[PDB]
Structure 1
């Protein structure tokens, strides 16, 4: 059937009965009233059964051996469905497929019932998930720590061409994977005031919110290691949240509990944008405060909570602990670690600071100013008083270091301050992270360099040793084996299976680049994938597409810097050229654009309306026929990504040079047989470098060109004046060609494009369409197109998260990865 494992005789029989046990005892249903949803749960529970054994021994193991623990703090974890992924890492896919088949059910039909765990906005959240999968696969004692939002990223609905947001109640039917651990609930404080008494400061009169943990298992790839992702849930104490007496109402008091519990109610739907709301800050301290207590407790036990030097010496803390800050969201971990160490454990400042800097590491994910976290001091002042004091004290000592290093450089001082003066004083979270961490890293080579050259230049000059780079990656398991079994099979037919956990081995495929059979096969799976997607489209969304055309797709969150607008310009151009010479042949294309706009991002929502507007015109023009279709992929999410990517021919990664930190979608397309048309931005540079620029469609300004233009000054009118085709499009938008009933509907877009385009869309127009012509040319030559594809696929190995994690492990955490199978799952009950 494929290498989804063995369909053993004994195990298929075993599976079936357990499937039945659960249907009866767990779901309390009988075959005569069970629905697909019930069948999905019976299975889920049956599968979950298989990793509890391993989950328990893995955790017990780490307790015995006591290795250095890695803690990945992130406000986001974009998990997606977990049934299939679990079967894959446990080599259970074929057995389950067989068993369910014998039970008379279609496993695939059941997998579609699982709701996505959308606790993330996009790239940052998905990285965290791939990282988790990689850390388990590499046998690291790592824990993902976050918030268990009851409402993840909103489900996108297109009404009249406009995006409509609706609550994502992903827990509505229950989450068979998580394990509530009410017994480990911890208290978290808010507000209050600071008392300075005799021997130390005291955080007093605080409001208490409880943090209840929920554990979700993270299985490594076929190595019997199952790590833990601990998500926190806000709960109100039953005392003060009722006991603070003297009139108000008993009923009202109970109803008001949903005020402390609002903290973990919903994820903020912003991608690369900073919103300074109190709720957000509260979420940020909540996950930090709870997690740290859990970390220190585990440490207090270790082998110190037995003997060792005997005396809670936190000198060995950094030797046992390592916490990674995914962006600045969990930045309060730094001052909070100091608070505990200094205030509660009573360590002297300097010893506390040494420990903190040695255990903390920060990862930066963007350079755009609007995405930088700058919290108003009055907020910190009211909500976390003692933390503010600590930050000022950190700032004080840091600046003293600077002054000592650069005597007289008074401007440098203000520039590096963690405190920003002006309208309202703010705290530059990024500056905080750099100062209190031993390592800071970019997510792509160019991005990392930009940090040292620009944004954090002064910090680099002060401590060059802190700055590193760790190019992002993705997991081959979910992003290849899971979503593209067909491609994985033919690859395995030639080079084996060892590449699943050693993606570099894909290079061996280079020697098949001229293999007639292979070329045919690679080409075949992609054709099958396109057919399956084309079907899914009519199945769930309804209104036909042509599987023979080139599948042109751009899927990622809607942003001005992502330039979906530039994509739009090309599409309209194609249309206009066809309308000019109808009977001229052109390579058929189905351009698919998908992604979510943050609810408050007016421009982004305007762009979605534009895309749909273009399709209304293009898709109903008889002269165009089936040569050009414009489709807006609805509710783009992980599960949807696993369907389109494998079916894509052309991958669009066209951000303005210098704006996309790295990107990971791009990597997903490269590994699944799609060619890339893009700019020398983020990881695109390393991809083309890895596959050779001849096998990549690069175009547009490089970072330097962008800057040159900015010195000069960017004037869009010039491009409007010199390019007729471009002019024609702008005037079409301005006159209502795409919005008859509302002729001025797109004035904001046009206005912006002409007068305040921060991302100079026009500057890359000419080179972009020219380049698009080159890909159409190559598509006309199937054999050569496929051969270039083989060149990309065979060379994408470097982009596996296993590599990224291996690097974090060695160069930052100080731990050695291991592909050693944990001692089987075997029963055991001590």
Structure 2
């Protein structure tokens, strides 16, 4: 049908049909009389997987023979989403499978919808890990992702009575055809116990053992025949575990609970023992696998020449003291040599400055669970502080601020300080964030070791986030500039030559229109909701958090409602305002925000005076597969965090690639996006970081804004008095109280500029030709935000390896 989806050759189609029927009969044990759509999905998935196998085996043999430096990306989250379509895209099989299935009487798009998301992450951090794997494979790097195979991923969100309810995400119920269990590379992981000091060093004894069993998933590069591996560990009890009899077998559950469920926090730390066990489990199993692979090529001088370990935040920070433990206690290296190897091997990426998100583990927990690691941490700390004291003699307060050990009520280990001390490179995730790290929270570290600190601005994969989710747009671009841009996104700059081309303008606007119709139809089918597809699609999708300021969007929505009610017969640009995202289960204020959004919808959507001029829709169960549907359909991307809080953002980038304009603050990567497109082509508003600092010095007084802005005061009075909750008039009083007295994120301070800037959006939308020209200028300058660019920078500036676009043979 369309060119970027590849060739449907007669031979290839005939073979795909034959293999589909083979898997239906032999693998699934069904005939066509009794097969359901789910059986058809599995038959297709097995058929496509068969095409990965030879390449997977060949890629791994190639790494064994060439022995390149290997890159190990360690993360507690990999937010993969669905695999079927992505695999077909990367192997150039999409049109062939469409034709084969069409010839068998089946619709491939309906089969794709059956697959479960692999939801092994919370949001941006986990999704970044997934983009990165895709880019590493596309760039020919010998890379492995290592994590945990959670039995239950991020919860499924249902909305009941306008409230979030959580359901378990039993993603493995029907089987996962993409993974291969590897019970033969099972490894032991130790917990608890005590330390004995012999004449021949320290020994960690009397430990409890849990087994780590690996499951491997293929990660195909884009049309280069490289298939890398994601290795996820699952927890198993040993067979002599607890070994009256029946209870001992049932208690195997205690050990296997380590890999049971993903902690559903985003930007929020809690010191729970189970989470610490998860973190050590992944590190201990991973490092053993790494060492085994290194020895099969005790000269550890060469270890950093053959191995890089990238820490995705502090969540796998125990890799530092575990590497030391192995080298000192088991391999018998002297401390100083071990430390040299460790620092040269490890690098740390920081993803947040919010203080409540930073991991600070109580010492008593580490003492019980990981007594040897605590000894090693103290020794790292004493040696590190000895260096600080030599460089800044007499600066006793600096010694307290830089310590890995925080004093107090409960002594804690600051894991971020541990990661900086033990890594040769430390990076933030957007230019403004990296600068903030050097000026504020890690200023002391930067002064001691300035060479360590870098920036690596985030990116997204253009395979999933353009070709897969928006083939119509990919196609109209390819018609003009060819297909090379899919793996070299900077080539999108060539589209600036088409900003005045009437045909290109028309085709861009047509693609958006088709995507909006398709999305409006999806909403009627699966959720019984009617929307005007000629309205401006105003979209804010991301996790629910005070810092992301869904509440600021709420206040705009109410403003627009109130203005319609005041002058009902005046024209206004119609909007469909869509907000979606999950709240962490124990985060009360986030749950109240969801309820506010649905309550505003209840009033607005049923007011006959409003008509179809304004609709407010809460999009339930926001996840990767839903992002692939709504992002292509958006007109306006809402990126409105308080300046200084969103370390990067990556949703922002996905919207820019797919032909939405952005309204946003100068925060995170929004800064760089505006720089690349031109500020004239972005809707920028609100306090800059320096303005937030100035208000903090004077003291933020929300009352002042209430007193001076009548439109704002009317909204607060409506919230307080029960206008949006007529049966429970005090329902929203905690939201009102927070906004008026303890708002850390200064929602009222950006309200006036936000409303004014939204009026400019509406004005431009009235002129479709000019809106579309601005869109072209955004898509054309989105190339910097390819994760291929990001990964090339990590490779050259941190890992010491050279990317390659060279194909392996098929």
Query: Whole-Å Cα distance in 2 between the matches of residues 342 and 221 of structure 1?
Result: 42
Query: Whole-Å Cα distance in 1 between the matches of residues 619 and 791 of structure 2?
Result: 32
Q: Secondary structure at the match of 2:680?
A: helix
Query: Which string of whole-angstrom CA distances, capped at 9 and with x for unpartnered residues, describes residues 688-721 of structure 1?
Result: 0000000000000000000000000000000000
Query: Whole-Å Cα distance in 2 between the matches of residues 355 and 361 of structure 1?
Result: 12
Question: What is the CA distance between 1:2 and its match in structure 2?
Answer: 3.4
Q: Which runs of 5+ in 1 are unaligned?
A: 243-248, 303-311, 825-830
* Contact 2:426/2:452 (8 A) holds in 1: yes
Q: Secondary structure at the match of 2:666?
A: coil
Q: Superposition pairs for residues 431-580 of structure 1, below 5 Å?
A: 431-580=417-566
Q: TM-score by structure 2 length?
A: 1.00
Q: Secondary structure at the match of 1:259?
A: helix
Matched, 1:630 2:630: no
Query: Whole-Å Cα distance in 2 between the matches of residues 538 and 360 of structure 1?
Result: 50
Q: Secondary structure at the match of 2:266?
A: coil
Q: Secondary structure at the match of 1:583?
A: coil
Question: What is the CA distance between 1:389 and its match in structure 2?
Answer: 0.1
Query: Which string of whole-angstrom CA distances, capped at 9 and with x for unpartnered residues, describes residues 651-698 of structure 1?
Result: 000000000000000000000000000000000000000000000000
Query: Whole-Å Cα distance in 2 between the matches of residues 587 and 478 of structure 1?
Result: 32
Q: Secondary structure at the match of 1:3?
A: helix
Query: Whole-Å Cα distance in 2 between the matches of residues 445 and 259 of structure 1?
Result: 44
Query: Which string of whole-angstrom CA distances, capped at 9 and with x for unpartnered residues, describes residues 100-150 of structure 1?
Result: 000010000000000000000000000000000000000000000000000
Q: Secondary structure at the match of 2:775?
A: helix
Query: Whole-Å Cα distance in 1 between the matches of residues 524 and 288 of structure 2?
Result: 51
Query: Whole-Å Cα distance in 2 between the matches of residues 293 and 538 of structure 1?
Result: 51
Q: Which residue of 2 aligns with 1:749?
A: 735
Query: Which string of whole-angstrom CA distances, capped at 9 and with x for unpartnered residues, describes residues 506-554 of structure 1?
Result: 0000000000000000000000000000000011111200000000000
Q: Secondary structure at the match of 1:561?
A: helix
Which of the numbers 684, 687, 696 marks the counterpart of 2:682? Answer: 696
Query: Whole-Å Cα distance in 1 between the matches of residues 439 and 527 of structure 2?
Result: 47
Query: Whole-Å Cα distance in 1 between the matches of residues 391 and 528 of structure 2?
Result: 66
Q: Which residue of 2 aligns with 1:130?
A: 131
Query: Which string of whole-angstrom CA distances, capped at 9 and with x for unpartnered residues, describes residues 598-620 of structure 1?
Result: 00000000000000000000000
Query: Whole-Å Cα distance in 1 between the matches of residues 21 and 189 of structure 2?
Result: 43
Query: Whole-Å Cα distance in 1 between the matches of residues 529 and 165 of structure 2?
Result: 21
Q: Secondary structure at the match of 2:548?
A: coil
Question: What is the CA distance between 1:3 and its match in structure 2?
Answer: 2.0
Question: What is the CA distance between 1:593 and its match in structure 2?
Answer: 0.1
Query: Which string of whole-angstrom CA distances, capped at 9 and with x for unpartnered residues, describes residues 4-38 of structure 1?
Result: 00000100000000000000000000000000000
Q: Secondary structure at the match of 1:105?
A: coil
* Contact 2:82/2:118 (8 A) holds in 1: yes
Q: Secondary structure at the match of 2:537?
A: strand
Query: Which string of whole-angstrom CA distances, capped at 9 and with x for unpartnered residues, describes residues 624-651 of structure 1?
Result: 0000000000000000000000000000
Question: What is the CA distance between 1:241 and its match in structure 2?
Answer: 3.2
Question: What is the CA distance between 1:199 and its match in structure 2?
Answer: 1.1
Query: Whole-Å Cα distance in 2 between the matches of residues 220 and 200 of structure 1?
Result: 46
Query: Whole-Å Cα distance in 1 between the matches of residues 726 and 242 of structure 2?
Result: 57
Query: Whole-Å Cα distance in 2 between the matches of residues 433 and 691 of structure 1?
Result: 35
Query: Which string of whole-angstrom CA distances, capped at 9 and with x for unpartnered residues, describes residues 361-400 of structure 1?
Result: 0000000000000000000000000000000000000000
Query: Which string of whole-angstrom CA distances, capped at 9 and with x for unpartnered residues, describes residues 767-790 of structure 1?
Result: 000000000000000000000000
Query: Whole-Å Cα distance in 1 between the matches of residues 671 and 187 of structure 2?
Result: 45
Question: What is the CA distance between 1:799 and its match in structure 2?
Answer: 0.1
Query: Which string of whole-angstrom CA distances, capped at 9 and with x for unpartnered residues, describes residues 23-59 of structure 1?
Result: 0000000000000000000000000000010000000
Question: What is the CA distance between 1:240 and its match in structure 2?
Answer: 3.5
Q: Which runs of 5+ in 2 are unaligned?
A: none
Query: Whole-Å Cα distance in 2 between the matches of residues 2 and 397 of structure 1?
Result: 60
Q: Secondary structure at the match of 2:214?
A: strand
Query: Whole-Å Cα distance in 2 between the matches of residues 241 and 721 of structure 1?
Result: 67
Displaced runs of 4 or more, over 4 A? none
Matched, 1:670 2:656: yes
Question: What is the CA distance between 1:191 and its match in structure 2?
Answer: 0.1
Q: Which residue of 2 aligns with 1:306?
A: none
Query: Whole-Å Cα distance in 1 between the matches of residues 194 and 200 of structure 2?
Result: 17
Query: Which string of whole-angstrom CA distances, capped at 9 and with x for unpartnered residues, describes residues 557-587 of structure 1?
Result: 0000000000000000000000000000000
Question: What is the CA distance between 1:313 and its match in structure 2?
Answer: 1.1
* Contact 2:144/2:230 (8 A) holds in 1: yes
* Contact 2:324/2:339 (8 A) holds in 1: yes
* Contact 2:190/2:208 (8 A) holds in 1: yes
Question: What is the CA distance between 1:481 and its match in structure 2?
Answer: 0.1
Query: Whole-Å Cα distance in 2 between the matches of residues 292 and 103 of structure 1?
Result: 47
* Contact 2:241/2:252 (8 A) holds in 1: no
Query: Whole-Å Cα distance in 2 between the matches of residues 233 and 253 of structure 1?
Result: 20
Question: What is the CA distance between 1:472 and its match in structure 2?
Answer: 0.2
